Design a protein around this ligand. Structure first.
Ligand SMILES: *[C@H](CS(=O)(=O)c1ccccc1)[C@H](CCc1ccccc1)NC(=O)[C@H](Cc1ccccc1)NC(=O)N1CCN(C)CC1
Length: 253
């Protein structure tokens, strides 16, 4: 019994991380952002908004190591969630936010848009197992662990049920160049060359002007796309959007 539309921001209005858009900066850390963003949302969902924390992309990006991939050169969503269950992740906010244990260290930049920040350019930061000044508790006690991590089947209904019951998920899809230009509506690949793989947070679904879609958060800042979000065609494994969905359930802090 699933609704025709669902938006995690409306279901869990006291979980501000669900509404928050991040910026990977000049670093291919999308695999880590999709993970920590979904984990942040699920911790809040799991505690009915009694715990709301930004889980540190910095901690995952820099401390997972080779099991997750190659840092700013790209990585793997499934192993990000596994690292969360084995070693946990500390808190950390946006660049220069002074939020949490290890806030993001890569400065924001413009991702295929004209803006006020430097344009994004072509190096993974070192793993620092120590929190930033003024933050407590210590890095060891700030860790949040997952109970498990799992793949969701390549099935529209299965993915919808997973989001409906357990919160936002991480997914992956093929980026073609016409995606770069997205502003509004439901994206479908119509033109442009293949560019590579991208990992994102899926937080809902709906139908817009007859087209079924997934509601997705990009990590290219809020001046990209639809205030940082996009919608992509749902139900056809379009660009592989339904083929690499991963999630997991938090441990209680
Ligand atoms: C995030 C995607 S992005 O930066 O938004 C982007 C970049 C280019 C084209 C489209 C989108 C990163 C970028 C990785 C990258 C860095 C530098 C040059 C080229 C690419 N992408 C990833 O982390 C992806 C995630 C992924 C995993 C599995 C399936 C689909 C997507 N992984 C990735 O690109 N990797 C895997 C690890 N390997 C060592 C490097 C390539």
């Amino acid at each position: 019994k699933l609704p025709a539309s669902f938006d995690a921001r409306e279901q869990w209005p006291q979980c501000p991380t669900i509404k928050e858009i991040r910026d990977q900066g000049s670093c291919g850390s999308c695999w880590a952002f999709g993970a920590v963003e979904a984990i942040s949302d699920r911790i809040c969902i799991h505690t009915n908004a009694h715990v709301s924390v930004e889980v540190s992309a910095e901690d995952l990006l820099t401390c997972c190591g080779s099991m997750c991939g190659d840092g700013c050169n790209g990585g793997y969503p499934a192993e990000a969630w596994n690292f969360w269950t084995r070693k946990g992740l500390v808190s950390g906010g946006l660049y220069e936010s002074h939020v949490g244990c290890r806030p993001y260290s890569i400065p924001p930049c413009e991702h295929h848009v004209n803006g006020s920040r430097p344009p994004c350019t072509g190096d993974t930061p070192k793993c620092s197992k120590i929190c930033e000044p003024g933050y407590s508790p210590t890095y060891k006690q700030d860790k949040h662990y997952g109970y498990n991590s799992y793949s969701v089947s390549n099935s529209e209904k299965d993915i919808m049920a997973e989001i409906y019951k357990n919160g936002p998920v991480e997914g992956a899809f093929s980026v073609y160049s016409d995606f770069l230009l997205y502003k509004s509506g439901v994206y479908q690949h119509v033109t442009g060359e293949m560019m590579g793989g991208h990992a994102i947070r899926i937080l809902g679904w709906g139908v817009e002007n007859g087209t079924p879609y997934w509601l997705v958060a990009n990590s290219w800042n809020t001046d990209w796309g639809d205030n940082g979000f996009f919608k992509i065609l749902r139900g056809q494994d379009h660009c592989g959007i339904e083929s690499e969905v991963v999630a997991g359930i938090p441990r209680t802090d």
